[PDB]
Design a protein around this ligand. Structure first.
Ligand SMILES: CC(=O)N[C@@H]1[C@@H](O)[C@H](O[C@@H]2O[C@H](CO)[C@H](O)[C@H](O)[C@H]2O[C@@H]2O[C@@H](C)[C@@H](O)[C@@H](O)[C@@H]2O)[C@@H](CO)O[C@H]1O
Ligand SMILES: [Cl-]
Ligand SMILES: [Cl-]
Ligand SMILES: [Hg+2]
Ligand SMILES: [Hg+2]
Ligand SMILES: [Hg+2]
Ligand SMILES: [Hg+2]
Ligand SMILES: [Hg+2]
Ligand SMILES: [Hg+2]
Length: 263
């Protein structure tokens, strides 16, 4: 059950005026592709707040990677789901090395040393790499049952150029005539149920490959791509959500650089 939205004053959407004319904003299976200009964040914030939505953000920081946690968490505090309930889950082999970062109200962090718990603690799970920093808004516009993010190096590439696993001996195998997009393994998520289904499927596929003496060209990312090819994501995030400015610059098609690699 969803309560009604309150009176809101905003620009009327124009049916005969497309959002963006420079990019694809909806997939062939009718899943929105999230670009700046396609969403009114005020409307979306209202919808998700009325549901008291809690977002879990998971990150793994092992060995030398624990050094990236401070900037990651500090910038997430400024740009990630601000205004909503957030629960950070930091998986690390060095619990005492996790930096003491000041969090806004309604936000918490749990350190897990290296999950039915996720089902009872959050509504959505967002899985990202730690050697990154948020530079702009990353909010509820990304929430949906299952989402993948367009890899910044292949969004304008033809499918045959995609670096999918091409060996039929692997469970992640995808032939040259198949494939929608090349998703980057560094940023995916969805409802807890859908994320666990995906991780469970990939874990099993990787075990099968191991028993067969084969390892996918791009490991987890290869399996993620195979999974999203067979189970279409309900939203696809544009490269605004996973960029590397040092390597790729700043093309006009990107009005915002929201989550980027750390040089
Ligand atoms: C068009 C082309 O092939 N460009 C190269 C990229 O594919 C490389 O990025 C790497 O891509 C593979 C999958 O093919 C995988 O996703 C790697 O994680 C990814 O490298 C990461 O992401 C990049 C955007 C950079 O931020 C890099 O520092 C990360 O480690 C890149 C980097 O090897 O080279 C292009 O030539
Ligand atoms: Cl994950
Ligand atoms: Cl992850
Ligand atoms: Hg628009
Ligand atoms: Hg996760
Ligand atoms: Hg993760
Ligand atoms: Hg998979
Ligand atoms: Hg896996
Ligand atoms: Hg995966």
């Amino acid at each position: 059950f969803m309560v009604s939205l309150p009176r809101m004053v905003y620009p009327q959407p124009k049916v005969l005026t497309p959002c963006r004319k420079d990019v694809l904003v909806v997939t062939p299976w009718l899943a929105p592709i999230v670009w700046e200009g396609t969403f009114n964040i005020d409307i979306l914030n209202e919808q998700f707040r009325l549901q008291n939505t809690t977002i879990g953000l998971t990150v793994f920081a092992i060995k030398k990677y624990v050094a990236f946690l401070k900037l990651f968490l500090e910038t997430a505090e400024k740009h990630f789901m601000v205004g909503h309930r957030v629960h950070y889950y930091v998986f690390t082999d060095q619990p005492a090395a996790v930096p003491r970062v000041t969090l806004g109200t309604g936000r918490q962090l749990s350190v897990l040393e290296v999950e039915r718990r996720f089902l009872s603690e959050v509504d959505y799970l967002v899985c990202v790499d730690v050697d990154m920093e948020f530079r702009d808004h990353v909010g509820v516009e990304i929430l949906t049952p299952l989402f993948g993010t367009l890899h910044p190096s292949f969004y304008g590439s033809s499918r045959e150029a995609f670096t999918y696993e091409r060996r039929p001996q692997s469970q992640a195998y995808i032939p040259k005539d198949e494939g929608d997009f090349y998703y980057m393994g560094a940023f995916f998520g969805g409802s807890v149920q859908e994320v666990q289904r995906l991780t469970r499927a990939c874990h099993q596929a990787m075990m099968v490959d191991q028993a067969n003496g084969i390892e996918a060209v791009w490991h987890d990312e290869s399996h993620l791509n195979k999974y999203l090819l067979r189970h279409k994501p309900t939203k696809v995030l544009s490269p605004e959500y996973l960029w590397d400015q040092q390597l790729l610059g700043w093309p006009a098609v990107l009005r915002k650089l929201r989550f980027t690699a750390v040089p």
